[PDB]
Amino acid sequence: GIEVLAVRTGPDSITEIEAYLNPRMGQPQNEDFYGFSDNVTVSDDFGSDAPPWKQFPCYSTARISLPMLNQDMTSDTILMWEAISCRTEVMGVNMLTNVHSAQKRVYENDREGTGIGVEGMGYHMFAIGGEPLELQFMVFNHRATYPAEATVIKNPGASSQVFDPNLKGTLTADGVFPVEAWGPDPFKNENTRYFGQYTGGTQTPPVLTFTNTQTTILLDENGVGPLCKGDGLFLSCADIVGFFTQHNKKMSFRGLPRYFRVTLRKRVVKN
Amino acid sequence: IEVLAVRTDSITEIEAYLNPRMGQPQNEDFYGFSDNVTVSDDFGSDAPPWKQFPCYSTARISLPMLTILMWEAISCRTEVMGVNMLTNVHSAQKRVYENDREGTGIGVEGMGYHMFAIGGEPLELQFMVFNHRATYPAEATVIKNPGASSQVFDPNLKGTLTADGVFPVEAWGPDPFKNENTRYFGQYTGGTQTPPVLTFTNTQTTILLDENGVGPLCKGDGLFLSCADIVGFFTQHNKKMSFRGLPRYFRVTLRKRVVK
Amino acid sequence: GIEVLAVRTGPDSITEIEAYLNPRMGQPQNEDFYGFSDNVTVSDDFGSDAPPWKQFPCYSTARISLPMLNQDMTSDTILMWEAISCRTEVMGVNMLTNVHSAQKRVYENDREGTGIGVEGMGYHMFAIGGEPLELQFMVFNHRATYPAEATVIKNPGASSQVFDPNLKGTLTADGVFPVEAWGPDPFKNENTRYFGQYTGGTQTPPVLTFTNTQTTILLDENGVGPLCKGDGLFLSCADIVGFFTQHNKKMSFRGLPRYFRVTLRKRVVKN
Amino acid sequence: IEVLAVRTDSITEIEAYLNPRMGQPQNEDFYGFSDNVTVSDDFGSDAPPWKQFPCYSTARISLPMLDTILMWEAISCRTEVMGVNMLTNVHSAQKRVYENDREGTGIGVEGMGYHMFAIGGEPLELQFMVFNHRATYPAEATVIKNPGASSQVFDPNLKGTLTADGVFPVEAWGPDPFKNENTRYFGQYTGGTQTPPVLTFTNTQTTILLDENGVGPLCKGDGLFLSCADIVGFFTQHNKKMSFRGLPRYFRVTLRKRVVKN
Amino acid sequence: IEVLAVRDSITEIEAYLNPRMGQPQNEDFYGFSDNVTVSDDFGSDAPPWKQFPCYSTARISLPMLTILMWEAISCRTEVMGVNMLTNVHSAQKRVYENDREGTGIGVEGMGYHMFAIGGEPLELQFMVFNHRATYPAEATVIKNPGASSQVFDPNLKGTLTADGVFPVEAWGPDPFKNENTRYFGQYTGGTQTPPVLTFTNTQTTILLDENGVGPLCKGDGLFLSCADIVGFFTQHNKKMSFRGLPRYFRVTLRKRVVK
Ligand SMILES: CC(=O)N[C@H]1[C@H](O[C@H]2[C@@H](O)[C@@H](CO)O[C@H](O[C@@H]3[C@H](O)[C@@H](O)[C@H](O)O[C@@H]3CO)[C@@H]2O)O[C@H](CO)[C@H](O)[C@@H]1O
Ligand SMILES: CC(=O)N[C@H]1[C@H](O[C@H]2[C@@H](O)[C@@H](CO)O[C@H](O[C@@H]3[C@H](O)[C@@H](O)[C@H](O)O[C@@H]3CO)[C@@H]2O)O[C@H](CO)[C@H](O)[C@@H]1O
Ligand SMILES: CC(=O)N[C@H]1[C@H](O[C@@H]2[C@@H](O)[C@@H](O)O[C@H](CO)[C@@H]2O)O[C@H](CO)[C@H](O)[C@@H]1O
Ligand SMILES: CC(=O)N[C@H]1[C@H](O[C@@H]2[C@@H](O)[C@@H](O)O[C@H](CO)[C@@H]2O)O[C@H](CO)[C@H](O)[C@@H]1O
Ligand SMILES: [K+]
Ligand SMILES: [K+]
Ligand SMILES: [K+]
Ligand SMILES: [K+]
Ligand SMILES: [K+]
Ligand SMILES: [Mg+2]
Ligand SMILES: [Mg+2]
Ligand SMILES: [Mg+2]
Ligand SMILES: [Mg+2]
Ligand SMILES: [Mg+2]
């Protein structure tokens, strides 16, 4: 319900922020497995499914405080920051050339060859908005009991295995909304742009690109970018690269951090 | 229909979801899945049990009440929702190293079949089957005794998608000889261990205007949405496999069109 | 050597035709395995190679009779139908979601899993022309003895395993020109547009798309579409989806029919 | 060459084919194939026999005879790998999908695709570069002898030109990006041995050969130089012996008369 | 740098960087790593020198020329020697090893292809798979980098100032810096992945930023960097080594007036 008016265009009308989101794969920060999940355990049935904390990835999010542009918030019009473009890069793609660190080998029976490296599912998504990303709760198995550390809808019922219009949330906190339990809500997010790709498998080769030359335009079909409510820019992502497999065949998620550059301009809006 | 001028009050937007109809009933523990797939020994004794195969999803959306005016669908967004759930490799899945009782679950793998249709009347179907001798269950809507020509194109074997969750995906497809008033789109990747590849964004708008600049015209002020979204197979520890589906989001923008 | 003159415009100037071509994978029409080849047998050497009839696919073709637009064919100029655009779709893709019909199972040793469905090579091609598709004879093994039912160059010699400028033909008949022995001739086909893709393997997943929204322009670099000599529109195709594998490991080609919509306009030509 | 006005019968089109040179002799039963590939135990005793490895195809096309002089300028091309249809053959003496059961189709052609072509007004300029510098190439092949360890990466001394058909090994020579000012080249490599081959064909694709300055290859000696290599994969026999399989390439080239300073 | 107008005025350079996969130049395995060994745990992880690839880099001296600077406006780049990967006879594990039959498997596995063109050294972010890895003395790394180095730590910076000693697995381009460099990278992982490479002399990449300004060559130096891991070479005894290829650079520069 924001009435959008004129773009401002002077030499001081554009700002740029840069930010990083570290991955939240499960293992705690400042400890030896930071960037990984704990070794994944698998239930015998849907009824007894209770994934332990640290064994599954959660979304990354941050609110970036922008310069406050309005001396008087009672004026007939105010300025808001409008996100018009971004650059985003998955960082540390270089580290995936490591095939020597405690990895199951290509020829395990012969105790020979390189490590198999990271392989399996890729889940890469990011979102840029003027308010938190709007979520739809949806799970593979509704009878999964998520641990206390996680933010989920408890006892969500059978309808949560597909679309249930009751089961909404917002990405309000870093490292607690499980990736497997929440996704972007296309019924909402009028003030956010999101982008995602899933490549499944457990032996799938990761495919990643990185360049500082690619800009994505964030303007909608009315030429309006995300408008930063309360001078807040919301960045969200998940970057599951695949799995790390140990000699003893235990497997963990590996994630990478994401870079964001967002170019914003001053937009007059009705107040 | 004699189509005259675009009117300009004059624009409306609708949003809808279609849940998948993979075979297991709603409001029960396996909703979103088929029942475990059984395989016949030969084409002559081929009776796929009810709940073991996916069916099309469909709905008619009631549009606001209205020479006549008709709602003309000019653009859409669509999205397969719940892609996020496929990051689950812990729920009762055959493991990567089953012989060692070790590794993640293998997750959902195998065939992707993704189709959607938006029109001003029900989707017109062409009946076509892998094996014409398959005996479909009573619950399913099929052409009985369709004959050998139903394994390829037979101009006689027509239908319309009039009901949700009963038209088998494996027996019906969009009819390219009809559907002048519907746009449809479909992608198929086969296999049983194929990596699923799904994308999601809110930045993709598809224009529904034909070559004459005319969108689907909503007969009886009804907008017809149809889809099927098979994501792949769920494999249990005991190697039983079932279809897994996901729900689809629709946004359609419509405008008032004057017609004769 | 047709001298092309003015395009006719106006409400009488365009016609649209729709047609289907059923696949010719080997098994006879109106019998239980229509849409399939017979089970593929494999030779022990190139010298003894003699593929039986029904075991290999052939090209589909039709000549569509167009409205006869000229009352007098002796006039200094006549009208010809000129194909300017087409839509084409592989029909029946829906059927490949069948993994229950007598298929080798994913876990055959456990008698468990879905069927493996249709997997392996995809060969998809179509042509639209004002005359028969012009062909180049070319074979994997020149010593192959084709059955009497098939149209081939007999005793073609070693040069037929690569390009031999002598080994020309035209796609004059339906369901008899083996796919594996004939391909489009890029030296000819001035009045035909053809398009093809091959994806090999026997375990390769089929990849097919279908929509009623995709139009292919058929005008050449001079703005001239295929001109229908004698009011005949030539449609050709092959749509090998992959193989059907039985429980006993016998394998057969599976094909699908193709839809054509062709938009034609009246073109004046010299006569 | 100082380039002046386009003098545009100012236009000519040529068509040609280059048969592959996979190793087995022409006019004999395995034409299009290599001989069955043998693998060495180590880099120090590595001598790939003649016929077991592919070589580049090349031809010079004689064009219509012609202060300043006229030269033919190639402005566009079509090219096509022909015979893609033959790869639907899964019956000709092929290892079977279920060999232990003596059942299934043949496995067909699978493995690496190496597809390159070049169109120039002089021979394609080459850079010598090899997997293993100690490989002993056969007498039939054109190689740099004793090329040194440098030749496993870039060495500026190790140059050649593609002057003859069917004798420059693909695995020892590639296009030189430091040269080829008067040639356009294009290449694609997909590796492996069981990789699915992917090939397309159409007569609706034309490639523009003009450079940044709007000049196409100028045909020195009124000669048009066509080169290629089209490895589609490996043929596997019942006894697991493997051989390269190649396909011929079509070229159409449109040329116009260009005035140049003599 | 305050950038004024585009100012005889154009120059072109060509260069190659040979790969630094680990085995020494002018010896029989130039282009390869040594055979890769694998640790039993993250705690005892000490990759020997020559078993892992490092970045290649060179500074190109530009012609002697408010001030004027050289501004890189376009490049061509190509991975050379793609032709050599058609070799399936040179001491490779056979397709049917049990039968001592078939071609060699050739080069297979991970592709890492990155290049950068700049007016100063490439700015690096340190990031490693396993922070407890002990890199050998020959390598340039951050010693005892801590758990934060397994993801993004803003304290863990370098610049690519030396050829063949910055491990690819420890350094990547820093998106927080590199305002005067253009970098491009693609990774495809796995150990049995088919390599996919293209080559042509018909592709030119524009190096101008959103303000129409290319890399400005500080001290009249042009900085070229790359890593081109094509995949692994597998011997009959299943030992595996990195295989790299050299990269070609063409760069077009123009004279630019700056304050
Ligand atoms: C053991 C197992 O995996 N059970 C799963 C169950 O499979 C059975 C089910 O698919 C039925 C059809 O509804 O078919 C088979 O059971 C038959 C018979 O129908 C049943 O009554 C008897 O118990 O055993 C028979 C042979 O097993 C399948 O085993 O399916 C459910 C979903 O419907 C769950 O997946 C359950 O884990
Ligand atoms: C058995 C078989 O597959 N035969 C095929 C034949 O393979 C031989 C061929 O590749 C030659 C080199 O020209 O090498 C091997 O044969 C050697 C020797 O050269 C030969 O004279 C002797 O009889 O056998 C030896 C091996 O023990 C290969 O077996 O090659 C042709 C193609 O050239 C056919 O593929 C034939 O089926
Ligand atoms: C023996 C081994 O691989 N140990 C792992 C260790 O695995 C643990 C698992 O065996 C079980 O005991 O649960 C705990 C939960 O924290 C561990 O997952 O995990 C650590 C990293 O967490 C490391 O991978 C060891 O090598
Ligand atoms: C037992 C079996 O799988 N039968 C197949 C049948 O195979 C036949 C083959 O075994 C041999 O006898 O030759 C004939 C040639 O016409 C058959 O190929 O084939 C039919 C299909 O025609 C069917 O697949 C049976 O199940
Ligand atoms: K930006
Ligand atoms: K819309
Ligand atoms: K024969
Ligand atoms: K041409
Ligand atoms: K350049
Ligand atoms: Mg909404
Ligand atoms: Mg119609
Ligand atoms: Mg011709
Ligand atoms: Mg040069
Ligand atoms: Mg910066």
Numbering used by the authors:
A (entry chain DDD): 24 to 294
B (entry chain CCC): 22 to 29, 32 to 89, 97 to 290
C (entry chain BBB): 21 to 291
D (entry chain AAA): 22 to 29, 32 to 89, 96 to 291
E (entry chain EEE): 22 to 28, 32 to 89, 97 to 290
What does the paper say about this structure?
In this study, by means of glycan microarray screening, NMR, surface plasmon resonance (SPR), and cell binding assays, we show that FA, which is the predominant glycolipid in ovine erythrocytes, serves as a cellular attachment receptor for the VP1 of a polyomavirus originally identified in sheep. This designated sheep polyomavirus (ShPyV) is a member of a non-enveloped, double-stranded DNA virus family with icosahedral capsids, scaffolded by the major capsid protein VP1. Thus, our studies present the first example of a polyomavirus VP1 protein interacting with a non-sialyl neutral glycan, complementing the principles of how polyomaviruses recognize their targets.
We also solved the crystal structure of VP1 in complex with the FA glycan precursor, globo-*N*-tetraose, which reveals negligible binding only. We therefore conclude that the terminal GalNAcα1-3GalNAc disaccharide is essential for the high affinity of the ShPyV VP1-FP complex. A dominance of the terminal GalNAcα1-3GalNAcβ Forssman disaccharide is apparent as the VP1 did not give binding signals with globoside glycolipid (P-antigen, position 25, [Table tbl1]), the precursor of the Forssman glycolipid which lacks the terminal α-linked GalNAc residue.
